[PDB]
DNA sequence: ATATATATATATATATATATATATATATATATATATATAT
DNA sequence: ATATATATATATATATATATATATATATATATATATATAT
């Protein structure tokens, strides 16, 4: 369903007593090439509700 | 057992291969020597599947591939020749230089007077599309870096005492500028839209 | 009609030129093409003031600067060679690598290519001469900087996962005992400079 | 002694196996530009 | 504060590996002819 240029993301939302803390990632492709390097990466880590 | 290749032919062929392109106005002796021994030069180069192209109207000699005609690699690739694909700004400046070289060759002859343009003239042409980078120093740095990179490509000379470069004849010898024409049409369309 | 050389010969010579050396163990077809027309390779490099080096005991072919009617003076000034000149530290590490190569050769013979040593094996061998940078990572950086260049000359492979390298047979000729004695004399001249 | 019946041999055809050439995918090396860090 | 070196990003070009298709060579099957052994 997503062979060409595509973008994918995930984000879990842990917390305690209202203190949000979010672990999220983003993975995307530029072309139909499916090398391990073709998938460009970036993690996230934040505790800001924004 | 058998004779060697003549010294001057060897030296001139190696010189051209090192430089790719050369001028009679620059080294007329090698120019005449090669043009007096084109068979020897091509025989030296054909084992490499290379050869030379010349332009006596503009007084320039340059190399050229001589592989077997039109294999599946129409977008050709050669062992001894690593090819390049220039970027947005590089090819943009190349198109600017192409258009002004075309104009010069009409208003100043087909290389009779070496094609020239001032830094303060090229910079406005770039500014048409890229706009003001932020300062005159930044403009000059941008254009001079690009011009140096193209000079490494054998396309332009360094600015003279009056900040005027000289366009090498090789610009007239590009393969498929139709891509440059399409790019320039796209650029003018974009700027007309984005103004 | 035309002096076009045979396509296979052009292929083999173009590859040899592209990498400057050719081993039968790796590319037997081109190696045997070269040794089938070695005089052709010579007569083609002769126009370029270059010559073909041959060592069949190790199944190796490499290109070397020819003597013109002037023996290339300082041959490193030859126009075509792309690389720089060898320097002291490079020669030191070359000598150590040749020492290990000759040890492995006495152990298993000359023609094979299985010799190896590890990054940590090299590190003391040079650290004795070069002093201690102050951290293991810094001396590893030193060694890898040397190894990158030496690979650029074809002496060694790239650092492997085991942090080792494979000695290339061509080192048998860069570390020629005659050339080693000449370099020893040059080192004595360097002593005179120190004097 | 000769006739005939049967076995054996040969030639050709076609089916199959294997070798090689080529097309395509993937991985790496170059490679060049730019941004940032660090040294003076 | 400036200059230099380094690391990373873009990115592209080359090399290597693997799979499939084609061509060729071999072998086996079938049919016919000839030789030979047996019977009358």
What does this structure look like?
The structure is cut from a larger assembly and holds one copy of chain A (50 residues) and two copies of chain B (195 residues). Chain A is an all-beta fold and 50 residues long. Chain A is 0% helix and 58% strand. Chain A contains no helices and three strands. Chain A has a three-stranded antiparallel beta sheet, with no helix packed on it. Chain B has 195 residues and is mainly alpha-helical. Chain B contains seven helices and five strands, in the order H-E-H-H-E-E-H-E-H-H-E-H. In chain B, the strands form two sheets. Chain B has a three-stranded antiparallel beta sheet, covered by helices on one side. Chain B has a two-stranded antiparallel sheet with strand order 4-5. In chain B, strand 2 and strand 3 form a beta hairpin. The longest helix of chain B is centred in the middle third of the chain and has 20 residues. Chain B is globular and about 75 Å long. Chains in contact: B-C. Chain B binds a DNA duplex (40 and 40 nucleotides) through loops.
Précis, in short:
The structure is cut from a larger assembly and holds one copy of chain A (50 residues) and two copies of chain B (195 residues). Chain A has 50 residues and is mostly beta strands. Chain A is built from no helices and three strands.
Describe how the helices and strands are arranged:
This is part of a larger assembly, with 1 copy of chain A (50 residues) and 2 copies of chain B (195 residues).
Chain A: E1 6-16, E2 19-29, E3 40-46
Antiparallel strand pairs in A: 1-2, 2-3
Chain B: H1 7-19, E1 21-23, H2 28-35, H3 38-45, E2 50-55, E3 60-65, H4 88-107, E4 116-118, H5 119-130, H6 136-152, E5 164-166, H7 178-193
Antiparallel strand pairs in B: 1-3, 2-3, 4-5
Helix pairs in contact in B: 1-2, 4-6, 4-7
The structure holds a DNA duplex (40 and 40 nucleotides).
Organism (chain A): Escherichia coli
Protein name (chain A): Chromosome partition protein Smc
PDB class: dna binding protein
């Amino acid at each position: 369903a997503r062979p060409g240029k595509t973008v994918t993301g995930i984000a879990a939302t842990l917390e305690r007593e209202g203190k949000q803390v979010r672990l999220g990632a983003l993975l995307w492709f530029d072309s139909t090439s499916s090398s391990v390097t073709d998938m460009k990466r970036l993690w996230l880590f934040s505790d800001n509700p924004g | 057992s058998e004779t060697r290749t003549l010294q001057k032919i060897r030296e001139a062929t190696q010189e051209l291969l090192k430089y790719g392109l050369l001028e009679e106005a620059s080294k007329p002796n090698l120019y005449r020597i090669v043009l007096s021994h084109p068979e020897e030069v091509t025989r030296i180069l054909e084992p490499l599947d290379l050869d030379i192209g010349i332009d006596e109207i503009r007084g320039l000699l340059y190399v050229k591939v001589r592989l077997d005609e039109t294999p599946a690699q129409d977008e050709w690739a050669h062992p001894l020749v690593r090819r390049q694909r220039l970027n947005l700004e590089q090819s943009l400046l190349v198109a600017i230089l192409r258009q002004h070289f075309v104009a010069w060759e009409q208003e100043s002859g087909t290389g009779a007077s070496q094609a020239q343009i001032a830094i303060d003239d090229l910079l406005p042409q770039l500014q048409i599309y890229l706009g003001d980078p932020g300062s005159e120093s930044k403009e000059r740095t941008r254009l001079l870096t690009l011009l140096d990179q193209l000079k490494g490509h054998g396309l332009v000379t360094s600015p003279d005492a009056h900040e005027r470069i000289v366009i090498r004849p090789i610009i007239a010898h590009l393969a498929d500028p139709i891509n440059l024409q399409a790019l320039l049409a796209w650029l003018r369309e974009q700027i007309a839209q984005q103004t």
